Each structure stands twice: as structure tokens, then as C-alpha cells.
Amino acid sequence: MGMLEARELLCERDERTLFSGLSFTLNAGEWVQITGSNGAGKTTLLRLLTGLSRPDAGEVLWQGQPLHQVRDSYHQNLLWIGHQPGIKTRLTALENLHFYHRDGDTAQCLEALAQAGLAGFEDIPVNQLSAGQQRRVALARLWLTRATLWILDEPFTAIDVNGVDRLTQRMAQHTEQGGIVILTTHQPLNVAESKIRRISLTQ
């Protein structure tokens, strides 16, 4: 079986029925990409799979158990990046990345922040950085994290092209060892159609 299974998720944001009856199961090691049309609602879908938002109907399942029970094991195996990067602007990049697990020693720190494209901007405060480079510390959290589930709410926003190729290379590397990445992106992505899978939240 697959760990993440969505069963009959129904969501109404401000009494607008965003999607109905949507149910998809994910086995180990696929790279589902949400390909919906409206701007808001695929973000609500990702918040619905992460457990930020409760289903108004139906349920999200992680390893056979509902999300209201298995929180301490589900949150051990997830990495969520929203439209907001989820970091503190007041601290520097290195302490913000050190808040998240490990970092510290050079085996897990100062190359993870380098492979996002932030080599040499490690000790600068975040509030004196460009918005894409602010997203790149949370985007640099990928290279140090052991979570099998990654969920991404526009990862490639204000990101230069070489950054996107490096992120997709590390991301497919995660896809190899049974890691699942669920993401939404606007841009047409340069990966072969054979590997990916598309779930569309139609209407």
C-alpha cells in the first residue's frame, strides 16, 4: 500500500465549493504535481494534505490511520513550504536553518545553504535580502531533511533557472529513495512526462 491516501475531501472556503469527491492514493516514490487552474484552492489542497486544515468532509490518511491520531509520526516525516517561507526575518539565515533539525556541524550545514544558491550570504540578516533569497533558506532545508514527504506551495517563485535545475535534481534524487514530493508550480517544468503524475482538482 501507499502511505498518503486522500479520501473524498470536500472543502468550502467562504461557502464556495472548491472541490468535491477527490480521492487519490500515493505509493512510495512518486512525484505528484497539482495542476489545478484557480490560484487559491490548490494551496488549500496542500494545507489539507499537510494537516493544517481539517477536511470538511472525508479524511486524509497516513499509513492507514487518520490524521487526527497519528500527528506525532506524520510530523516526523513531512517538510512543508508555503507561499510564505515559514522562517523568521529577524534572525540570520544560519540560525533560521539551524532551528530546523540538525544543521550545526558541517556535515549538514554550510553546503545545504550553498546548494540553494545562497553561498556567501549565510550570516546576513534575512530582512536585508531579496525575497527569492529569503525563500531559498527554507528551500535549502531540503538538503538536510530526512522526511519522506515534501509538500511545496510554489517552491520556484523568484528563483533563477540554475536554482530550478539544482532543485529538480535534488528533488528527483529524493524521488529515487521512495520519497514523495507533492508540489504546485506555475512555470512549465523541464522534467520528462514519464516520471511525473498529475492530479487535477477539476472545477
Binding site: 491520531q69 497519528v70 506525532d72 509520526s73 516526523q76
Partner: protein
């Protein structure tokens, strides 16, 4: 598993917090420790529980100083004075300096040990800044028994 460990640890914190809450509530309700009696509550027992004060227990008595009941020993700090509510009267013996706030016809609170015959060996006497203040239990004692004069509760031996 990890779920059981987390629930058990935070539940141990919960029961420790509730136990300390109940402990401080019951302590404070016991830390009222109402050794505050009136002279009527010495002679005839407390109004609610009818319990008598025993000989020798440390205790606190609110009462008005009688006019003409304060005789001071001229060669020592020894002062004997009788204090009353509008229900009864008890003698007080105090060795030490009296407060400057101590006047006849004013409310004082006596901390001391009870001897035989409703007599109190004071270890401390607290006289208040307010000349006309009566303690709440003593004030309710005189509101219940309707302001009988201090000469009436001057025990006629005194």
C-alpha cells in the same frame, strides 16, 4: 510507541499541575487558619463550629481596649489589660513594648497563648493606625448584640 510516550508525559504534567492546584487551594483554605477569635468566641465558643479554645494553644483575639483597664507595671514592660466584644470579655497579659497606636477604646489584635480562666499571655499586640477601626468579626459581634457599653463588659471584678 511515540504517541503513547508523548500522551503519558504530558498527562503526567497535567496530573502534577492539577494536584498542585488542589494542594494550594486546600492549603489556602486551611491557611485561613482562623485562630482569630473574639472574647465571646473564647467564653462561649465560635459561632459556627462551637469549638472551644484549649489551654495553651497559640491564638489571635480581636477586641476593643476597655477604658480604665490598662494598668502598667511601673518597673517593667509588663502590661495587663482586658479586651472585649459585645458578647464577652477576656484578660490579656503582655510583656514588651506596646505600640504607640494602643489607646483605650480602640481595637487591637492580641497574638498569644491562652491560660486557665480565659487569660491570654500575649506574645504580640497589634494596635491599628485607625482609631475607630473594629475587626470584621468583632464588628459583627457588636452589630449582632447591639452596641452594649464598655462598662457593661468591664467584668465587675475589674
Amino acid at each position: 510507541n511515540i504517541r503513547r510516550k508523548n500522551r503519558l508525559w504530558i498527562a503526567c504534567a497535567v496530573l502534577a499541575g492539577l494536584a498542585l492546584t488542589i494542594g494550594l487551594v486546600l492549603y489556602a483554605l486551611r491557611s485561613n487558619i482562623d485562630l482569630f477569635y473574639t472574647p465571646g468566641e473564647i467564653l462561649y465558643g465560635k459561632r459556627e463550629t462551637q469549638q472551644m479554645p484549649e489551654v495553651g494553644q497559640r491564638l489571635r483575639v480581636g477586641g476593643m481596649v476597655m477604658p480604665g483597664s490598662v494598668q502598667r507595671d511601673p518597673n517593667s514592660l509588663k502590661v495587663t489589660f482586658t479586651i472585649y466584644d459585645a458578647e464577652g470579655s477576656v484578660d490579656v497579659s503582655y510583656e514588651g513594648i506596646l505600640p504607640d497606636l494602643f489607646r483605650e477604646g480602640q481595637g487591637v489584635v492580641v497574638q498569644g497563648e491562652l491560660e486557665k480562666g480565659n487569660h491570654i499571655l500575649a506574645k504580640e499586640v497589634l494596635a491599628k493606625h485607625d482609631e475607630n477601626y473594629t475587626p470584621p468579626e468583632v464588628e459583627k459581634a457588636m452589630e449582632a448584640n447591639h452596641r452594649r457599653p464598655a462598662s457593661v463588659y468591664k467584668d465587675p471584678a475589674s
